[PDB]
């Protein structure tokens, strides 16, 4: 019912984090998998009815989908000149603010 | 899914967002500091400064007794 | 695919109406801490 590829989780660099966000783990479906305490697995995986319902709750309602992120915003259009102007403005504003705070107080 | 707005994770990790908001938040903080330090807070909302709690006229707590002359009574009680 | 989103929405106003006065009041309260009786 749920297509994992259409959930917008394909733009994640870390493979382990990507598998975590879809509620999937290739290691756990193996019949010889043993968790830290030492209990064998029954082959269910993360979710027993993963095939019946498509995916898990993690793969149903994700809260971090880089695919839906805006194409812009990963690069600043104003470039280096904008950053230089911002640096000048923030230095000037910090100086003005500290001067106003000192002047209006009782020294 | 999504209701048709930019994700909060996308906005909060933007150079444009942190360039715009490196000015607005400190500006508001400084504006509030100047509002308090310049004495505007006392005058706008009528709060007593530490030296204006008791005047030379009365050395007790204020008490308002009239409902329709309340404006004049509180004007008299606040006299410095 | 390309996703384009509006900048100003109802959520923008809802966020800012609670965010701006909060920062102003926090600055005022911080200034209040250094007043000597």
């Amino acid at each position: 019912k749920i297509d994992i590829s259409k959930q917008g989780l394909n733009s994640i660099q870390n493979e382990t984090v990507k598998l975590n966000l879809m509620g999937k783990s290739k290691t756990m479906e193996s019949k010889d998998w043993v968790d830290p305490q030492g209990r064998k697995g029954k082959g269910y995986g993360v979710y027993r009815f993963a095939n019946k319902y498509g995916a898990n709750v993690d793969g149903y309602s994700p809260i971090y989908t880089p695919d839906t992120w805006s194409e812009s915003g990963d690069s600043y259009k104003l470039g280096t000149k904008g950053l230089i102007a911002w640096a000048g403005l923030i230095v000037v504003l910090l100086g003005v603010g500290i001067n106003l705070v000192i002047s209006t107080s009782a020294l | 899914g999504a209701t048709g707005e930019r994700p909060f994770s996308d906005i909060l990790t933007s150079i444009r967002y942190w360039v715009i908001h490196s000015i607005t938040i400190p500006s508001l903080f400084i504006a509030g500091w100047l509002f308090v330090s310049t004495g505007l807070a006392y005058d706008v909302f009528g709060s007593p400064r530490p030296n204006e709690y008791f005047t030379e006229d009365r050395q007790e707590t204020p008490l308002i007794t009239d409902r329709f002359n309340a404006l004049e009574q509180v004007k008299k009680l606040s006299e410095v | 695919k390309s996703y384009t989103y509006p900048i100003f929405t109802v959520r923008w106003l809802a966020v800012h109406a609670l965010a701006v006065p909060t920062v102003f009041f926090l600055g005022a309260i911080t200034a209040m801490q250094f007043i000597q009786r």
Binding site: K77, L78, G82, L89, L93, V96, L100 | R16, V19, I20, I23, T24, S27, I30, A31, L34, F35, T38, G39, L40 | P6, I7, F8
Partner: peptide, 30 residues
């Protein structure tokens, strides 16, 4: 004048925000 100081402080903030956001805002308006 005390309120004038705060208004004068707030003016460059509005100027900077308009300078940084006018383009995409006009794009969204159309």
């Amino acid at each position: 004048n005390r309120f004038g100081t705060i208004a004068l402080l707030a003016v460059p903030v509005i100027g900077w925000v308009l300078f940084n956001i006018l383009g995409p805002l006009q794009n969204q308006l159309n």
